[PDB]
């Protein structure tokens, strides 16, 4: 989907503060995944050496 | 009276149908039917004592 706004007010039914809250939410999601993936890397056999 | 009785049903129901459509129409505008039902849940709650 495309929105075309620098500052979207209501897109897909969401208020201007609601878009901010979801953005932050995706930042937290990608942060969490990267952290899990690094924990798995720390328990990897290749970090043993 | 019988004639008015027969007509009121078809008229009144046609008014109801345009009413439900306008509701759907508000649904699409707000976004999801699920979201609008949420805000409806918040308003009903605030209207009750909940």
From Swiss-Prot, chain A:
Cellular localization per UniProt: Mitochondrion intermembrane space
Coiled coil: none
Primary role: Constitutes the soluble short form (S-MGM1) generated by cleavage by PCP1, which plays a central role in mitochondrial inner membrane fusion and cristae morphology. The transmembrane long form (L-MGM1) and the S-MGM1 form higher-order helical assemblies that coordinate the fusion of mitochondrial inner membranes. Inner membrane-anchored L-MGM1 molecules initiate membrane remodeling by recruiting soluble S-MGM1 to rapidly polymerize into a flexible cylindrical scaffold encaging the mitochondrial inner membrane.
Protein name as it appears in the record: Dynamin-like GTPase MGM1, small form
Species of provenance: Chaetomium thermophilum (strain DSM 1495 / CBS 144.50 / IMI 039719)
Entire-sequence positions represented here: 766 to 814 of 939
From Swiss-Prot, chain B:
Top-level taxon: Eukaryota
Biological source species: Chaetomium thermophilum (strain DSM 1495 / CBS 144.50 / IMI 039719) (Thermochaetoides thermophila)
Name of the protein in its database record: Dynamin-like GTPase MGM1, small form
Protein purpose: Constitutes the soluble short form (S-MGM1) generated by cleavage by PCP1, which plays a central role in mitochondrial inner membrane fusion and cristae morphology. The transmembrane long form (L-MGM1) and the S-MGM1 form higher-order helical assemblies that coordinate the fusion of mitochondrial inner membranes. Inner membrane-anchored L-MGM1 molecules initiate membrane remodeling by recruiting soluble S-MGM1 to rapidly polymerize into a flexible cylindrical scaffold encaging the mitochondrial inner membrane.
Compartments (UniProt record): Mitochondrion intermembrane space
């Amino acid at each position: 989907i495309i929105v075309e706004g620098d500052h979207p007010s209501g897109a897909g039914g969401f208020s201007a503060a609601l878009l901010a809250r979801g953005r932050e939410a995706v930042f937290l999601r990608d942060r969490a995944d990267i952290l899990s993936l690094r924990i798995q890397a720390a328990k990897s056999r290749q970090c043993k050496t | 009276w019988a004639q008015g009785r027969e007509h009121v049903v078809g008229v009144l129901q046609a008014e109801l149908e345009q009413c439900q459509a306008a509701m759907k129409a508000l649904e699409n505008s707000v976004g999801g039917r699920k979201k609008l039902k949420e805000v409806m849940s918040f308003v009903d709650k605030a209207r009750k004592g909940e």
